[PDB]
């Protein structure tokens, strides 16, 4: 074991692979239930009922198993000729608006106009909570310049808040509270699936076959995750970085975040590699922040820049081991791209690490010189220092068809889609900082930077930063309606890192542990 | 289904799941170990004692009982009365070998009772046991111990003469086996599997010992299968299994000869990786790469700078980057575990290996014939055992330093002797050794070969004497350096890669790594 102790001991994590083996009879039941659920997605339903069903499928974390059928269902609903089923119905209108836009089918914000009067949304809509929640959730699919969706968000938030915690109807109470914490659009797929499996079971309209399949598929996917954490744990203990006197829970936390970025079994290898990079980002961040002197870090940065480990022995052991693990892992990842994808990715991985440590160095220079950057000067560097250019460009290297230097240079040039994602991850992380640490006047975080600029208060500045999150999400949403040159799975990665940030930096140990226990460690009890 | 293919990495990657040992039988192995400990310690006649610990050794169990075996051998050597071995050819011969094996000197003159000035008395020709014990004991001799040379050539002729004629089942098995290879030249782990089957035929088999030998061998086997899964997964991850030039699995089979113990697992895996890369890159240099490609590969290696790797085509770049990445890994393991960054050392032994290859391709195109001395100077490096042994020293020496690593890499006698032996045993087994010396004072194939076999015996005597002499070296590297040679003896006889040689190798593979031993 390690001291200080990690969330779980590594031998435990390695034990999980065979502790939770899914019995062969459950594997065969899963294939059988999959076909039954396909049939259900395909079956004629009233259009609202079909949208509700495919919303449930998504929410249960199953869209990846039914991509063809869900899309085909959505298209069908977009072609249903008579609109009387949603017109003047706030829930149906909202749900349709959201499901259509999630699937690349435009619906104008004007569909909501009829729910307003001269002064704004009609106060009487507060008599229908399901309606309000669907409007709230739909509002997050909005784009810049869509003022009615901003009004919808403000109205629905306010009305739902006037009842959060006091709703005498258990499943809706739960869903509203959950939504006010984070909208569905901002949550991770995989962690939402585990929460919603429990919520769905308690709802009035539960389909037991869908529910049964959701639990079974959850456990099967979980068994792939458990094998991955076994492999990653063995790797991590092999690096010796578990014994550095910093970066407690680095590996496990990186892996838990990676599951938010991409959970699908068929992306296991990519997910392992992203988890290794994230554990090294966590470790090296600590090296730069809470261990190395300015002279040690200058040499760390120079070795990385030049990809030349000749002078590595000038660094003390606890700095040298992270350095050489970064080097060895980056070479391994670049090599996988050569072996698997036909393209040598070492220049790419070396480059994003060099860019990242240059950004750490800039922050350190500001901190030591007492520089107070503007928000815009801070974010241009801090969107690099958060590590998502590194993680995203790496993800692109490992998945793009026919990778080339020119394609990698393009992604690393931060096209709007990627820039929005990295800025979001940075600002979201900064917003997660509790005011216990704010009182410490760290000038190199978003809120404080804006406070310093404008002479604004902490509350006004926080509100400003929160507004930036909503703005960059609007840009992300619109980028998906013209995403070229990007394709799946990179389009999903770019969005899902943001969701990971929202989920893991909500504005801590126990909460993390709870999430890891339900998603990675404990299977769902089946009654089969 | 269909025959499990030892060459199929699909199959190999799955091992570490199958052939479990029941947690039941672990506990019985702890219990029989303690029974076997008392067996080794309980007073017996000095002869019964030596036979008992030789047996333990050949069952491959000495590593479990090193203190009890040493103290047993030391008690025998202090036994004041010599009547139990004097004039007994078996007893004299076993005492000689087991004492020398444990670093206690016995003079070649303990065999004077069996000889006169005309040599060994031809009357010993039907004492088969004594002739066999004499034969096995002879390979413990040093240079200039001539009574020991005479012993060998004499025992060898007399045992050859009675082979069809031996009644005892276990002894006829043992004589046949010894005439192919003496015990001293065989690997510990592959011999242990063979001997379990033979020992069970012996009149004097101790069923406690036999039962513990089988159960330990299966437990150990389970450690190895997990090792092979991991290594095969690695190999497939490199993509080098799909290059057009068995690789990993063979390297691993050799390494089990160099070291088999569960407690040395990590070192064994790294040695196997290097083993696999040596064979791979030797083929890159020998056949596949152009001249210009080999000079970039060489340059990249010398400067440990992969900036220009992209000028190599795929099938050259992959071995190079794999060599680089794995050398970085092994060097790093030394930092993590041993406190010493070993990347400069692994980069250097690789840079030397490649020159090795640059030299023997120059001698091919440049139409130069070397003296056997000049060729072995290079061929003891190209065989790759400096790489492998310097790496094994890096990973196991107490308090490693650059200075200690520069000394092992200078190749002092003990190391130089193992390395020459590995290259010579290889050339015997096929600008080779024999083909070079032929091109010395101008000899035949028959007289060359005999001269080479002679060199094998000579270097073994020098190795043997080193183990008695002052040395900066300790265990386990002492064992690694002798045991590579044994690995060479055992596998180079059948290296051909088709026909009888491949089915023999496959069978060793299957009996020692795959198939557990049937228990009770």
Q: How is A231-243 classified by DSSP, letter by letter?
A: HHHHHHHHHTGGG
- Beta carbons of B486 and B505 less than 8 angstroms apart: no
Which of B304, B336, B345 is the best residue to mutate to test the A interface, defined by the most A CB atoms within 10 Å of its own CB?
B336
Give me the residues paired with residue B18 across strands.
Answer: B15
Tell me how far CA of residue B97 lies from CA of A461, B135, B187, B198, B469, in angstroms.
86, 10, 17, 21, 17
Q: What is the C-alpha separation between A435 and A492, in angstroms, rounded?
A: 33
Q: How many CA atoms lie within 13 A of A137 on its CB side?
A: 27
- Beta carbons of B303 and B261 less than 8 angstroms apart: no
Q: What is the C-alpha separation between B112 and B86, in angstroms, rounded?
A: 10
Which ranges in B62-206 belong to alpha helices (H)? 66-77, 89-101, 128-138, 146-162, 169-180, 188-199
Q: What is the C-alpha separation between B37 and B494, in angstroms, rounded?
A: 38
- What is the dihedral sign for C-alpha A464, A470, A472, A474? negative
- Beta carbons of A459 and A507 less than 8 angstroms apart: no
Chain B CB contacts of A335 below 8 Å:
238, 321-322, 325
Q: Which long-range contacts (CB under 8 A, 24 or more apart) does B126-131 make?
A: B126/B162, B127/B89, B127/B90, B128/B159, B128/B162, B128/B166, B128/B168, B128/B171, B128/B175, B129/B90, B129/B171, B130/B88, B130/B89, B130/B90, B130/B93, B131/B89, B131/B155, B131/B158, B131/B159
Chain A CB contacts of B322 below 8 Å:
335
Three-state DSSP state, B323: helix
Tell me how far CA of residue A427 lies from CA of A281, A370, A378, A473, B255, in angstroms.
18, 21, 11, 12, 54
Which ranges in B1-112 belong to alpha helices (H)? 9-14, 23-41, 46-58, 66-77, 89-101
In this complex, the residue of B309, B335, B341 whose CB is nearest that of residue A344 is B309
* Core vs surface per residue B331-355: b (16+ CB within 10 A) or e: bbbbbbebebbbbbbbbbbbeebbe
Closest to A67 (Cα-Cα) out of A41, A47, A46, A48: A41
Chain A residue with minimum CA distance to B341:
A313
Which of B322, B343, B347, B348 is the best residue to mutate to test the A interface, defined by the most A CB atoms within 10 Å of its own CB?
B343
Does A221-528 match A23-220 at the fold level?
no
Three-state DSSP state, A473: helix
Which ranges in B200-264 belong to alpha helices (H)? 207-238, 248-258
- A327 to chain B, minimum CA–CA distance in Å? 9
- Beta carbons of B64 and B216 less than 8 angstroms apart: yes
* Core vs surface per residue A149-168: b (16+ CB within 10 A) or e: bbbbbebbbebbeebeeebe
- Beta carbons of A242 and A251 less than 8 angstroms apart: yes
**Residues 6+ positions from A278 with CB-CB distance below 8 Å:** A254, A255, A257, A258, A387, A391
Breaks (C-N over 2.5 A) in chain A follow: 507
**Residues 6+ positions from B167 with CB-CB distance below 8 Å:** none
Q: What is the C-alpha separation between A315 and B509, in angstroms, rounded?
A: 45
Q: How many CA atoms lie within 13 A of B423 on its CB side?
A: 24
* Core vs surface per residue B309-318: b (16+ CB within 10 A) or e: beebeebbbb
Q: Is A370 left (phi over 0), alpha (psi -120 to 50) or beta?
A: left
Chain A CB contacts of B309 below 8 Å:
344, 346
Give me the residues paired with residue B311 across strands.
Answer: none
Q: What is the C-alpha separation between B440 and B454, in angstroms, rounded?
A: 16
Q: Do A328 and B325 touch (CB under 8 A)?
A: yes
**Residues 6+ positions from A364 with CB-CB distance below 8 Å:** A288, A294, A297
- B312 to chain A, minimum CA–CA distance in Å? 11
First CA to last CA across chain A, in angstroms?
37
Q: What is the C-alpha separation between B98 and A434, in angstroms, rounded?
A: 73
Reported resolution, Å: 1.8
Q: What is the C-alpha separation between A454 and A457, in angstroms, rounded?
A: 9
Chain A residue with minimum CA distance to B326:
A328
Q: What is the C-alpha separation between A15 and A20, in angstroms, rounded?
A: 9
Measured at the alpha carbon of residue A33, what is the angle toward residues A27 and A34, in degrees to the nearest 5? 90
Q: Do A344 and B239 touch (CB under 8 A)?
A: no
Chain A CB contacts of B337 below 8 Å:
240
Chain A CB contacts of B310 below 8 Å:
344, 347
How many CB contacts within 8 angstroms connect chain A with chain B? 61
Q: What is the C-alpha separation between B377 and B365, in angstroms, rounded?
A: 19
**Residues 6+ positions from A354 with CB-CB distance below 8 Å:** A301, A304, A305
Burial class (CB in 10 A: 0-12, 13-18, 19+), B27: exposed
Give the distance from CA A307 to its chain's centroid. Answer: 31
**Residues 6+ positions from A14 with CB-CB distance below 8 Å:** A230, A233, A234
B115: enclosing H helix or E strand: strand B115-116
By DSSP bridging, strand A120-121 and strand A116-117 are: antiparallel
- Beta carbons of B369 and B431 less than 8 angstroms apart: yes
A121: enclosing H helix or E strand: strand A120-121
- B5 in a labelled binding site: no
Q: Does B237 touch chain A (CB under 8 A)?
A: yes
Q: Do B341 and A331 touch (CB under 8 A)?
A: no
Query: Which experimental technique did the depositors report for determining this structure?
Result: X-ray
Chain A residue with minimum CA distance to B235:
A339
Phi, psi of B59 (to 5 degrees): -75, 0
Q: What is the C-alpha separation between A349 and A372, in angstroms, rounded?
A: 31
- B500 in a labelled binding site: no
**Residues 6+ positions from B406 with CB-CB distance below 8 Å:** none
Chain A CB contacts of B266 below 8 Å:
none
CATH number of this structure's domain A23-220, picked from the four choices 1.10.10.10, 1.50.10.130, 3.90.1330.10, 3.40.50.12280: 1.50.10.130
Q: How many CA atoms lie within 13 A of B40 on its CB side?
A: 25
- Beta carbons of B427 and B434 less than 8 angstroms apart: yes
Q: What is the C-alpha separation between A395 and B179, in angstroms, rounded?
A: 61
Q: Do B328 and A324 touch (CB under 8 A)?
A: yes
- Beta carbons of B126 and B168 less than 8 angstroms apart: no
Q: Do A320 and B341 touch (CB under 8 A)?
A: yes
Which ranges in B411-493 belong to alpha helices (H)? 413-429, 433-437, 445-466, 477-492
- Beta carbons of B120 and B163 less than 8 angstroms apart: no
In this complex, the residue of B239, B304, B329 whose CB is nearest that of residue A328 is B329
Q: Do A310 and B324 touch (CB under 8 A)?
A: no
In this complex, the residue of B306, B332, B337 whose CB is nearest that of residue A328 is B332
Chain A CB contacts of B325 below 8 Å:
328, 331-332, 335
Angle between helices A416-431 and A388-399 (to 10 degrees): 140
Chain A CB contacts of B238 below 8 Å:
335, 339
Fold adopted by A221-528 = Farnesyl Diphosphate Synthase (1.10.600)
In residues, how long is chain B? 520
B507: enclosing H helix or E strand: helix B499-509
- Beta carbons of A106 and A481 less than 8 angstroms apart: yes
Looking at the domain covering B22-219, what would its CATH class be? mainly alpha
Q: What is the 3-state secondary structure (H, E, C) of A254-266?
A: HHHHHHHHCCCHH
Q: How many CA atoms lie within 13 A of B173 on its CB side?
A: 13
* Residues flagged as binding site of A for Mg(2+): 285, 289, 363, 429
Tell me how far CA of residue A306 lies from CA of A315, A354, B85, B305, in angstroms.
16, 8, 71, 10
- Beta carbons of A334 and A346 less than 8 angstroms apart: yes
Q: Do B328 and A325 touch (CB under 8 A)?
A: no
Is the peptide bond between A4 and the residue preceding it cis, with omega within 30 degrees of 0? yes
Is the peptide bond between B415 and the residue preceding it cis, with omega within 30 degrees of 0? no
Breaks (C-N over 2.5 A) in chain B follow: 245, 430
Burial class (CB in 10 A: 0-12, 13-18, 19+), A313: middle
Which ranges in A291-414 belong to alpha helices (H)? 294-306, 317-341, 346-369, 375-385, 388-399, 405-412
Burial class (CB in 10 A: 0-12, 13-18, 19+), B120: buried
Q: How many CA atoms lie within 13 A of A17 on its CB side?
A: 13
Closest to A501 (Cα-Cα) out of A415, A434, A432: A432
Q: What is the C-alpha separation between A384 and A351, in angstroms, rounded?
A: 12
Q: Does B321 touch chain A (CB under 8 A)?
A: yes
Q: What is the C-alpha separation between A338 and B284, in angstroms, rounded?
A: 18
Question: For chain B, what are the domain ranges?
Answer: 22-219, 220-520
Q: How many CA atoms lie within 13 A of A194 on its CB side?
A: 21
According to CATH, the superfamily of the domain at B220-520 is Farnesyl Diphosphate Synthase (1.10.600.10)
């Amino acid at each position: 074991a390690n001291y200080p102790p990690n969330l779980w001991d590594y031998e435990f994590l390695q034990s999980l692979g065979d502790q939770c083996t899914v019995e062969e009879k459950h594997l065969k039941l899963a294939d059988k239930l999959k076909e039954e659920v396909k049939s259900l997605i395909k079956q004629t339903m009233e259009p609202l009922t079909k949208l509700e069903f495919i919303d449930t499928v998504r929410r249960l974390g199953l869209k990846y198993q039914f991509e063809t059928e869900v899309k085909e269902a959505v298209v069908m609903v977009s072609k249903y000729e008579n609109d009387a089923w949603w017109i003047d119905n706030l829930h149906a209108t909202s749900l349709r608006f959201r499901i259509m836009r999630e699937n690349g089918i435009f619906v104008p914000q004007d569909v909501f106009e009829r729910f307003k009067d001269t002064d704004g949304f009609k106060n009487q809509l507060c008599e229908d909570v399901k309606g309000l929640l669907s409007l709230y959730e739909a509002s997050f699919l909005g784009w810049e310049g869509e003022d009615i969706l901003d009004e919808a968000r403000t109205f629905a938030t306010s009305k739902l808040k006037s009842i959060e915690g006091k709703i005498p109807s258990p499943s809706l109470a739960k869903k509203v509270s959950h939504a006010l914490d984070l909208p569905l659009h901002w949550r991770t797929i995989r962690y939402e699936a585990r929460w919603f499996i429990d919520t769905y079971e308690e709802e009035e309209d539960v389909n037991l076959t869908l529910l049964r399949y959701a639990k079974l598929d959850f456990n099967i996917v979980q068994s792939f995750h458990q094998k991955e954490i076994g492999r990653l744990s063995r790797w991590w203990v092999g690096t010796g970085l578990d014994k550095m006197p910093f970066a407690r829970n680095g590996l496990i936390q990186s892996y838990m975040y990676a599951i938010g970025m991409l959970f699908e079994p068929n992306l296991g290898e990519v997910r392992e590699m992203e988890a290794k990079v994230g554990a090294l980002i966590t470790t090296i961040d600590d090296v730069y922040d809470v261990y190395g002197t300015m002279e040690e870090l200058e040499l760390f940065t120079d070795i990385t820049n030049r990809w030349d480990i000749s002078k590595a022995d000038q660094l003390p052991r606890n700095i040298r081991m992270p350095l050489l693990t970064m080097f060895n892992t980056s070479n391994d990842i670049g090599y996988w791209a050569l072996k698997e994808r036909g393209f040598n990715g070492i220049p790419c991985t070396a480059k994003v690490w060099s860019d990242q440590l240059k950004s750490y160095t800039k922050e350190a220079k500001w901190f030591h010189e007492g520089h107070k950057p503007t928000l815009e000067e801070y974010l241009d560097n801090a969107l690099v220092s958060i590590g998502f250019p590194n993680l995203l460009v790496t993800s692109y290297l490992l998945t793009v068809e026919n990778p080339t230097k020119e394609k990698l240079d393009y992604v690393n040039s931060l096209p709007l889609f990627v820039r929005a994602s990295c800025i979001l991850c940075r600002i979201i992380n900064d917003l997660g900082t509790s005011p216990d640490e704010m009182e410490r006047g760290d000038n190199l975080k978003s809120i404080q930077c804006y406070m310093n600029e404008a002479g604004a208060s902490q509350e006004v500045a926080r509100e400003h930063i929160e507004g930036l999150v909503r703005m960059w999400w609007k840009r992300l949403n619109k980028c998906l309606f013209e995403p070229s040159p990007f394709a799946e799975p990179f389009l999903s990665f770019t969005v899902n890192v943001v969701r990971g940030s929202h989920f893991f930096y909500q504005y801590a140990e126990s909460w993390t542990k709870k999430q890891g226990m339900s998603v990675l460690i404990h299977p769902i009890p089946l009654n089969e």
